[PDB]
């Protein structure tokens, strides 16, 4: 199947099953990464190289005052990617336990986290003209195709001048694959590009993550605005 409408028989249960899953996951890096904590540094290093280009190379350079971490969990990305590069960071996540642990996990640099929003992305509206970078990693599979498009549109309205949205996620080989355990979908490159392009966002960069374990789905980063 090629859409969520086909693989998601009950949209209400698609969301409630995912909320239930994450509510009893340990608030640790291994919990965030499904046992793949050993690739966290490899992931963060590529994300930094991918992002530093928009921040260093003009013209129309991306600012460094504020970033939003979407589906942030305990702040794995906020801690090692975003806080070293942006003056302040906002986090949003559906799981209360992760936002609470983030205060401890982030340590002293976590004092630069401005807001800990507790919300599903499908219900979340980032404030207009607020963010230089909106980072969306390993969470787009928890939204339906339509909710993802609408969320990206709301994100576009919250970007400051020259700001970007970044999506980094697993890509399926073909079509849309449903994961029954965590209640998320995996989409192929064509589906994701169509959702993005079809929602009114411009695709600026696209990069496959190298050096990942052989056994996992491929991971891609997209920069959009």
């Amino acid at each position: 199947r090629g859409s969520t409408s086909e693989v998601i028989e009950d949209e209400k249960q698609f969301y409630s099953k995912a909320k239930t899953y994450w509510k009893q996951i340990p608030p640790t890096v291994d919990g965030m990464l499904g046992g793949y904590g050993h690739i966290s540094s490899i992931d963060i290093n590529s994300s930094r190289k991918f992002l530093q280009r928009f921040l260093r190379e003009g013209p129309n350079k991306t600012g460094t005052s504020c970033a939003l971490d979407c589906g942030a969990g305990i702040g794995r990305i906020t801690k090692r990617l975003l806080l070293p590069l942006f003056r302040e960071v906002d986090m949003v996540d559906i799981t209360e336990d992760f936002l609470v642990q983030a205060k401890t996990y982030l340590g002293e640099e976590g004092k630069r986290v401005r807001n800990y929003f507790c919300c599903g992305l499908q219900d979340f509206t980032p404030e207009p003209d607020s963010y230089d970078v909106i980072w969306i990693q390993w969470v787009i599979g928890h939204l339906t195709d339509q909710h993802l498009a609408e969320f990206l549109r709301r994100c576009k309205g919250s970007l400051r001048p020259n700001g970007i949205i970044v999506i980094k996620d697993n890509m399926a080989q073909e079509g849309v694959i449903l994961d029954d355990v965590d209640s998320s979908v995996c989409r192929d490159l064509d589906v994701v590009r169509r959702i993005i392009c079809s929602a009114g966002l411009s695709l600026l960069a696209e990069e496959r993550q190298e050096n990942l374990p052989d056994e996992i789905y491929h991971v891609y980063s997209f920069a959009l605005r």
Binding site: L33, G34, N170, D179, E215, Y217
Partner: peptide
């Protein structure tokens, strides 16, 4: 997060 190809 990262996942084994099912």
């Amino acid at each position: 997060g990262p996942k084994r190809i099912a």
